[PDB]
């Protein structure tokens, strides 16, 4: 849907992100730029152009590039909300 949930088996993620509140760029959120071929992210259905919305409940819809990078890097069971537009 316009917004979806992806259950990554956290335990490397095989994905690349671009954007942020200060470095907002085109694929004003933090957007998925690349996804490795065999990476966990690709197996889990995460698509290029998806704007990451939240990481295990922590919203990134308006978060610094590094703030989002740290969110995806410390989810502590993992769930990522995305915006497919």
């Amino acid at each position: 849907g316009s917004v979806e949930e992806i259950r990554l088996p956290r335990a490397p993620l095989g994905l690349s992100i671009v954007g942020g509140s200060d470095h907002s760029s085109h694929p004003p959120g933090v957007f998925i730029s690349k996804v490795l071929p065999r990476g966990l992210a690709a197996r889990s259905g995460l698509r290029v152009g998806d704007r990451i919305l939240a990481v295990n409940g922590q919203d990134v819809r308006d978060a610094t590039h590094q703030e989002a990078v740290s969110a995806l890097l410390r989810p502590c069971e993992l769930s990522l909300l995305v915006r497919r537009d």
Binding site: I17, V18, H65, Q66
Partner: peptide, 10 residues
């Protein structure tokens, strides 16, 4: 868009 396109692979 703006400039300084930063990308981070996780």
């Amino acid at each position: 868009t703006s400039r300084q396109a930063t990308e981070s692979t996780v």
